[PDB]
Amino acid sequence: YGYYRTVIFSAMFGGYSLYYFNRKTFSFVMPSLVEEIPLDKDDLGFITSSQSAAYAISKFVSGVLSDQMSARWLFSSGLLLVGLVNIFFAWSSTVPVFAALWFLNGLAQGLGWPPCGKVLRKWFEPSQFGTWWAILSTSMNLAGGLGPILATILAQSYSWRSTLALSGALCVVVSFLCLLLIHNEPADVGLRNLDPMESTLQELLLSPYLWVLSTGYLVVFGVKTCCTDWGQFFLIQEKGQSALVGSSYMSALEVGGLVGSIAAGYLSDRAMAKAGLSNYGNPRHGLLLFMMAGMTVSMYLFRVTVTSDSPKLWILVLGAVFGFSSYGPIALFGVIANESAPPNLCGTSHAIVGLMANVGGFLAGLPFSTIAKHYSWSTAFWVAEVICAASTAAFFLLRNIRTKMGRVS
Length: 409
Known about the structure:
Elements: H1 2-36, H2 41-65, H3 73-89, H4 95-108, H5 113-123, H6 129-145, H7 148-157, H8 160-181, H9 201-204, H10 208-237, H11 243-274, H12 285-304, H13 312-340, H14 346-363, H15 366-374, H16 377-397
PDB class: transport protein
Keywords: G6PT, cryo-EM, apo, transport protein
Assembly: monomeric
């Protein structure tokens, strides 16, 4: 029983790592391209926004579409298309073809996660679902970490064209292997399927739990993005610190976030296993509320206590704590959304919470800068903290509402 779990998890890990590395290879190899071919920063923003829009639209459409077909053909086709796009990028010359191919890459990249989530839910009992979710999700962190060094080393002894071609060929080979290996359903090999304890979209959208979860995810994502974007500006312009302090703060925040995501997954899974079965509440709500309280406390302490005569250790500890308390709930919202949804309508819920995330991420962009430039940065951070506190109070107020979606008996 465990051998198939091991092989499927290994294949998914490799596939997702290749996804992330070939998503970020452009920014990885950017300097050599600039040296060989002149570039204009406006066109760089053009390309980046093109991919951002394509990836968002593809994520939504793939989330909607994943439940209609299998979760293996989609994964393999997505990786094959990404590899083909990266290969064909090596012979492009001008900016428009760059933009078109990179838009196609953004469209292709949307097929990655939903099949993996469906397979993970189908193959794992609830006592290990969140833990293995977080463990698999760490692959993108691993790729983002050990991508640039390899890119620079390879570019030292070869041109960027060869690097892109090799990456594309490797992606195609990995796609073939993943198509060969991954098994979507336990009963397909012939063994006994796990007992899944129908629902229709019309009464799927009429469930208040989905709206509550979406609002919470929007708020937490907005707070995270605003803080991670404007922390350096707040610490430099007003607190009078140095750039090294900001870099160390960012690194500590990332490390704390990784640790928080992993620990949240593990502890939530342990609590779910420990708890009983009922149609009211959810065992992960306690951890979610604790981590949101950590958000609020860390943000208030960072806003108030941190001054111009603060040792670097205080800033590092605050950054690590905020990263922990911020990257916990972000993964926990997705885990809850996928788990609690009806078995045949999970991808739609994932797409809905993703587009809420997109809206929340937008809401912390230009308006935040406008508020900061109007009065000050401290006013903007106070507004963000007040919104976070109100959101966590509201979420705690409704911990006992119906948690299962779909038709109700």
